Symmetry: C3
Subunit: 407 residues, 3 copies
Amino acid sequence: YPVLQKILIGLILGAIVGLILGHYGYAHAVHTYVKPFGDLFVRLLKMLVMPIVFASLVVGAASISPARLGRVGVKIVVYYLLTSAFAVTLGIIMARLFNPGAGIHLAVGGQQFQPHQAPPLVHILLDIVPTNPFGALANGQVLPTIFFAIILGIAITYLMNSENEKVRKSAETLLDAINGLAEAMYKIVNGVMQYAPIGVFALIAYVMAEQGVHVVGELAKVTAAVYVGLTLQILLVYFVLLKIYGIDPISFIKHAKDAMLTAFVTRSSSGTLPVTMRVAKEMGISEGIYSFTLPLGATINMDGTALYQGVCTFFIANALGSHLTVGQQLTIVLTAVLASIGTAGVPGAGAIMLAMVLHSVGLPLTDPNVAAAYAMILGIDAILDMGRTMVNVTGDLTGTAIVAKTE
Amino acid sequence: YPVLQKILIGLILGAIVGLILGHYGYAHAVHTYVKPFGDLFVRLLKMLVMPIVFASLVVGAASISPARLGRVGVKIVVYYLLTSAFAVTLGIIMARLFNPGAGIHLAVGGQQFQPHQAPPLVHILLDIVPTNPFGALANGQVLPTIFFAIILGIAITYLMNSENEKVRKSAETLLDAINGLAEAMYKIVNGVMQYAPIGVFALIAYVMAEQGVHVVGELAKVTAAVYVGLTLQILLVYFVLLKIYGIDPISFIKHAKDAMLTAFVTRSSSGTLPVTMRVAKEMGISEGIYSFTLPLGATINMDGTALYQGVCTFFIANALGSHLTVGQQLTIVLTAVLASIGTAGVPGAGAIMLAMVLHSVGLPLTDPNVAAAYAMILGIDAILDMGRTMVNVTGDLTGTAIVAKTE
Amino acid sequence: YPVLQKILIGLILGAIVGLILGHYGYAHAVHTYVKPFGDLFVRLLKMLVMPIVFASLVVGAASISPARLGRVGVKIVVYYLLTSAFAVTLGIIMARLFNPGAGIHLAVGGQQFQPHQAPPLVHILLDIVPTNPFGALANGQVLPTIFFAIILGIAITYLMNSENEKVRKSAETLLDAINGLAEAMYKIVNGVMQYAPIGVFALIAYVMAEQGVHVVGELAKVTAAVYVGLTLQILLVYFVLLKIYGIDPISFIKHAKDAMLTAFVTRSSSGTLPVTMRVAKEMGISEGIYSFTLPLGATINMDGTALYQGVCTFFIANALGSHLTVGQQLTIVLTAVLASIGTAGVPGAGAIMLAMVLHSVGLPLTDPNVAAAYAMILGIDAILDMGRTMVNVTGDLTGTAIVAKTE
Ligand SMILES: N[C@H](C(=O)O)[C@H](OCc1ccccc1)C(=O)O
Ligand SMILES: N[C@H](C(=O)O)[C@H](OCc1ccccc1)C(=O)O
Ligand SMILES: N[C@H](C(=O)O)[C@H](OCc1ccccc1)C(=O)O
């Protein structure tokens, strides 16, 4: 079987056969038939995310405790914050280049219930230190898991340096077992990726059926302004920073191919952690960097979302007719990067970041005009999700590759 | 101590001392006193179910991946479906041989709230793939655990055949650790089984006290119609299929003794998984079969239940006086087997399988007449439960032994 | 760094800097600035409790199954019950010595909703057997964890004495891995303790700011009675039971220093289990004993709390001016120890014990006279909490040290 080129065969063939069933009216025929097979690929990928993160990090933290992780962390965080600053500013620039929401229309009535406010920042940061590390594992919670795997990984290094060889014996057993699990999930990530072409096919067969035949109108200018923005993010920020650190862009892209396409159809950043990690091991990076930077990046580094929040804020302010302060769009840029940090763990964050970025400008989702305009964006949001998720994993790999060269 | 005949001693003694306290009115004195000792034995048994299943299946998947597990799995499923088909039809045949519900009385008022409808089949089948496999373990969920153990066990076998002997070194360590846990619970099961005769005593001391002195009247005909059906299930379908597959029935029965009797007093098919599994290993069956077919069978193969649903539907339709379609009791048979698959994981399925098999014939529990008659069955439901749970586990062992001979 | 004296340098400075901020109004400034650092420390400790308890007890159940554990447990329980009986009677004796509640004022009408009643005893005991051992781990549940670790450890020992060396091979592998984790958590308890000085400083900085400057008046007589009582507990019961058992009290206090001081600033018996456990290991005691008698003591042996319940009953009855039965304060003492067994696992028990000790005397929290007095105590409750939690862990160490010398 061709494989990995079979995904692309299923991608193009699906996107057309869904789009054809979309304009013909069979959107909810696809939902009750084709979709479950596309979900199956997502479920199987998600299955691996917890073991592969915990395992490959305890193993990963056999690596110079402070000088690595500490400086790796500091660099990857400084990378993440600056790329997200670019992402939003390019989204603003693209929404001034285009004009999404030219028509001051939009009928008013039937709208948002306003997402719950982000928890106090102190109670977000204090929460990266888990209280029951079995608990964190037992339900999602990547951030407390990252903390625990590093603190266990550093301890088990300090254990294998013990002058007692019952201590250095038992510590070696545990680490190997945990490494067993690590390697096991990477073997299943090859299995789950064999089903990908059936899953990929069935995923865009639904997105193009339910939201594709709705991409026309003023919303076409949104989808274009976002996607051109996302393309320019890839070329202007990723390729340039990749070149300026001496790692070949196309050799990077050839390796990233698997992780990119699963992120594009899964529309889950943390969901495609197993594929983005395997693609980083397959890329030659050590587990001391990638086992840490990738899951952290699937939680803080949202470049595609930060760009989408650029153009979405403008859209709504254009749908109402707000002047957007001839000078103070630097507030939309500031609280878009501050959103990612102050939302960190808190689940369903994509809706609550945009909520506080829209409130930052002065367009709360509570005023029925702002909300009716946001409602029209949500008619084509799965289309925009694909492109923005795909950039959310690119930044992860790109930052991981830069930290790999520096450290 | 005599032991394993100590169970039979406590059973006969307990059932008499329960039944004697039953007709003397001290049913709630047994609830508040004898009962907890019966609960302890169930608690301790349940305790081992999660580790023993997960452990002995990762270990269990050290066995030719496709040709075994696949064909094992296909056979056992084809077995399960056809045994469930016989069971319901034998229940129909036993309900036409007897006449449960001769009196068209039953006073109306005070009945069911109608159980929750079974989740859409695609969100039951997709649910067999877990998302957080640690979470699967964290709270019950035998089905997604089975899927993960097997997917881990296939991964850990492919890992051991690697040309790198750091990867095989770490694979072996993990497998053996997991196998430590496997053997651990099996050694515990021997202990918990030493408490069995006290637990056994205290359980039928309750069931006969609370529902025993209630088994008189038209309900005696039901209990006789179900139990003669359960006896004939073992004799006509198990002892025939066992013999026709070249394994001695009595040699099988002698080995099944422990598993049979705890299932009869626990009334939990998954609850007596460690005893049915220990009895399978002690039977000499390999972990490549029994470690997969037994926890699957405590979730799909409910022959005793499917048989009970035959006579229960007939009881309600005779209480009302419905004709039961002179020909179309095939619809009762059909939806009984399709209840087992379409319920799978979903908790409290015993009521929801019967809710839809009754709805299939045309007797909804929403109708105050149907539900008034169904309320009378529940007054002797734990009497019926013992017999049906005991046949639920037999077929799991019977199927396991048939697959062992075949594969 | 000086260390373990840098804790003391922070405690004194923090107690004065909180107290100074308190009588100057800036209590709620300290809550929103200093307090988080104090929390970080407590979160970090609580993080270890669940692995450290489970691990160092499967490993700790490498030791003569019955003769040890059985007799160990039966000693430590009889120990626990007698020390808790002393504590409450030293509470009554210190409350008759002082007179907390001279003034029969207290204005009425702003009071307690009455804490949920303690679950029936049989469902407390039956609940010490967990039903899903992974469950118990995944969420708190120190008692059922204890029961699983001990039943695992007994089984893994019997497993290691098998004439087959595939079973003995795997059991040894499992045990080392579990011990890998055991060791690892201790290595971490050294790191988490390096943060203690800052954590300690920020913790009394709070309690002295929010409840310090409220310690004046008739509540001063309370605080004094309790603390004098708790001091007289340590001198008269621990140092006397230590001496009489042949373990130098001051050498014991040199060793207990770390666990004593964190229990005082954390106010969490079970939260400082890691510091109490490493200080038992570093004391030279065996995992056979300490690994079982320490968590079981952070769940039954609240000496300092049962002392408080003595003087609190008196204060409330003094506030109302009840005679406290010229004789029947024995019923306070009796139900005070029963409270500890009869509350076991059941969370929030602290209040739910005081509830029933007060109801025992005959002053339910529901009488808005009793309740208006009880809410006055709660004003200086964190101040009393420190002193009593530190006496709650001392008894756990003291018992373990007595049982070590005996067994
Ligand atoms: N679907 C996107 C992704 O997974 O990258 C993402 O939605 C999910 C999400 C993931 C992480 C944090 C917040 C929200 C987004 O659109 O921002
Ligand atoms: N007690 C029986 C068993 O566990 O086999 C069974 O109850 C539980 C159950 C198990 C599986 C599916 C439905 C219901 C029944 O009463 O039919
Ligand atoms: N601080 C005490 C302790 O942890 O020992 C304790 O407070 C916490 C607690 C512990 C156990 C049950 C309920 C509440 C008490 O005052 O009884």
